[PDB]
Swiss-Prot record, chains A, D:
Full-sequence portion shown in this chain: 242 to 298 of 298
Tissues in which the UniProt entry reports expression: Isoform 1 and isoform 2 are expressed at very low levels or not detectable in most adult tissues. Detected in adult heart, placenta, lung, lymph node, spleen and ovary, and in several carcinoma cell lines. Isoform 2 is detected in fetal kidney, heart and spleen, and at lower levels in adult brain, skeletal muscle and peripheral blood leukocytes.
Species lineage: Eukaryota, Metazoa, Chordata, Craniata, Vertebrata
Name of this protein: Baculoviral IAP repeat-containing protein 7
Entry note about domains: The RING domain is essential for autoubiquitination.
Family to which this protein belongs: Belongs to the IAP family.
Superkingdom to which the source organism belongs: Eukaryota
Assembly notes: Binds to CASP9. Interaction with DIABLO/SMAC via the BIR domain disrupts binding to CASP9 and apoptotic suppressor activity. Interacts with TAB1. In vitro, interacts with CASP3 and CASP7 via its BIR domain.
Chain's role: Apoptotic regulator capable of exerting proapoptotic and anti-apoptotic activities and plays crucial roles in apoptosis, cell proliferation, and cell cycle control. Its anti-apoptotic activity is mediated through the inhibition of CASP3, CASP7 and CASP9, as well as by its E3 ubiquitin-protein ligase activity. As it is a weak caspase inhibitor, its anti-apoptotic activity is thought to be due to its ability to ubiquitinate DIABLO/SMAC targeting it for degradation thereby promoting cell survival.
From Swiss-Prot, chain B:
Site features described as Interacts with activating enzyme, chain residue numbers: R55, R73
Organism for this UniProt entry: Homo sapiens
Modified residues ((Microbial infection) ADP-ribosylthreonine): T67
Residues recorded with modification Phosphoserine: S66
Result of changing K49R: No effect on HLTF-mediated polyubiquitination of PCNA. Impairs ubiquitination by CRL2(KLHDC3) E3 ligase complex
Protein name: Ubiquitin
Cross-link (Glycyl lysine isopeptide (Lys-Gly) (interchain with G-Cter in ubiquitin)): K7, K12, K28, K30, K34, K49, K64
From Swiss-Prot, chains C, E:
Pfam families assigned to the protein according to its UniProt record, in alphabetical order: UQ_con
Protein name in the entry: Ubiquitin-conjugating enzyme E2 D2
EC number: 2.3.2.23, 2.3.2.24
The protein's role, per its UniProt record: Accepts ubiquitin from the E1 complex and catalyzes its covalent attachment to other proteins. Catalyzes 'Lys-48'-linked polyubiquitination. Mediates the selective degradation of short-lived and abnormal proteins. Functions in the E6/E6-AP-induced ubiquitination of p53/TP53. Mediates ubiquitination of PEX5 and SQSTM1 and autoubiquitination of STUB1 and TRAF6.
Length: 57, 77, 146, 57, 146, 75
């Protein structure tokens, strides 16, 4: 079930890296490697106004 | 009421509490609050058929434990 | 693209939807074959339709090429098997998976969108005489999809 | 190692619920129940100029 | 507040900090007793100091009330045992825990804050003659804390 | 390999030489945790680590444990 949490944080574009970048306004997340190639959000299609690096702390 | 599953675009399966008399719009709203996808981007499919907004779960004969599929809004052509 | 395609393939092994199957033809991970069951209580019911899939080397940032092998009667699919679906072109999203694409295509079958048909004659028949359109669809399923 | 994951996603204010809300610009997260009262990030003290609801699926 | 306090308590048991101990006295989870060892290389070294901690019903959105019950010589701590520390009033963060508060307190002991001290006569001494300040601080430690 | 206990109690593993100052370290913590160095107060034992000194000047050994808390002030 560690797998389950592991899937949770996995970028849904590359299906590989963990998500670190949140899109605003929509709030969907991708990994830093996928982000720069996305003009629109792959999940909801909302335009991406800005990209914020997230920190777990 | 009763519960159904939706397989979300990204592939996770979420569970929803629904009335058999709930409209498809009803469900898209629940999906929106959960997944953050606006209803107009949602296309819901059950038994390989799209579910239309103005209808209910009963119209598609959707029962307890049914698995609905979510894909992006698409345009026929 | 390759890793992404492998991860997809695994998720298919794990949690396939009910009406579709898909996978690499050969050892070539970029060329797939797929199967779609005709939706029940539709003219394509009882039908099994084959498709071919080709992933571009920049997948998934560019859509896969998908086409029917099996002959089918429908305004959105021409005699070359080409499918007119926006998600296969400008409405593509890199989060969509072949699984979702096949499910998308399946829902076209019972919900043909008369708007911008690929095969206008077929749409015309669907619009005017629906009894007819069903007959031809059923017949085509019978020859080709069995 | 699963404890690393379950505790990485835990809101550090209530120590209970999973994080949902991202603070911008700083990028730290808290759960949706803790977020509303907070004008300053509890983690780094950055003013919260906006907050964004995330959907991690 | 209660869940959050239990969590902190569980964490304390799971990782006891050095030099600091805290926990409920009775069955009241909202009133804690705490002790701090005098930090090495300071006038309080070798001393033990007791504090009382009262959590508000809205913790951790408001800070805990913390006070020394052991007499101590320091510009930020008065004879009622009240402490002048910003994180206990305006600069409190809801992510702070008792563990961290106690550590901030130790930290204050080694390095007093010159800005707006609670016991001006002590601060005055600390400001001018340090040998005096350190001396009296140790004597006070020798007398009250050992 | 050293260890830092963050504001929230998460233990991060660092990588540094004894040559690295206390200011240099706060930057790595910032890079990792997104916390401005001015909001960082680091503690060895019960005592604070100021900006100018070094990891070697405080006698920090291999796998030594440091504690981060929030910036403090007030009398
Ligand atoms: Zn990615
Ligand atoms: Zn989105
Ligand atoms: Zn919370
Ligand atoms: Zn922050």
């Amino acid at each position: 079930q560690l797998r389950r949490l592991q899937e949770e944080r996995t970028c849904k574009v590359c299906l590989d890296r963990a998500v670190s970048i949140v899109f605003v306004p929509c709030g969907h997340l991708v990994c830093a490697e996928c982000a720069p190639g996305l003009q629109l959000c792959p999940i909801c299609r909302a335009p991406v106004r800005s990209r914020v690096r997230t920190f777990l702390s | 009421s009763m519960q159904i599953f939706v397989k979300t675009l990204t592939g996770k399966t979420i569970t929803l509490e629904v009335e058999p008399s709930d409209t498809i719009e009803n469900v898209k709203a629940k999906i929106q609050d959960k997944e953050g996808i606006p209803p107009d981007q949602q296309r819901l499919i059950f038994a390989g058929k799209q579910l239309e907004d103005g209808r209910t779960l009963s119209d598609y004969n959707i029962q307890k434990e049914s698995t609905l599929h979510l894909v992006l809004r698409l345009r026929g052509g | 693209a390759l890793k992404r395609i492998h991860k997809e393939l695994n998720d298919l092994a794990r949690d396939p939807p009910a009406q579709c199957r898909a996978g690499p033809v050969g050892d070539d991970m970029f060329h797939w074959q797929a199967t779609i069951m005709g939706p029940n209580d539709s003219p394509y019911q009882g039908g099994v339709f084959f498709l071919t899939i080709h992933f571009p080397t920049d997948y998934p940032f560019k859509p896969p090429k998908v086409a029917f092998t099996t002959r089918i009667y429908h305004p959105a699919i021409n005699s070359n098997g080409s499918i007119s679906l926006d998600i296969l072109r400008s409405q593509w999203s890199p989060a969509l998976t072949i699984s979702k694409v096949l499910l998308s295509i399946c829902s076209l079958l019972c919900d043909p969108n008369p708007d911008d048909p690929l095969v206008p004659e077929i749409a015309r028949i669907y619009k005017t005489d629906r009894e007819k359109y069903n007959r031809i669809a059923r017949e085509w399923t019978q020859k080709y999809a069995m």
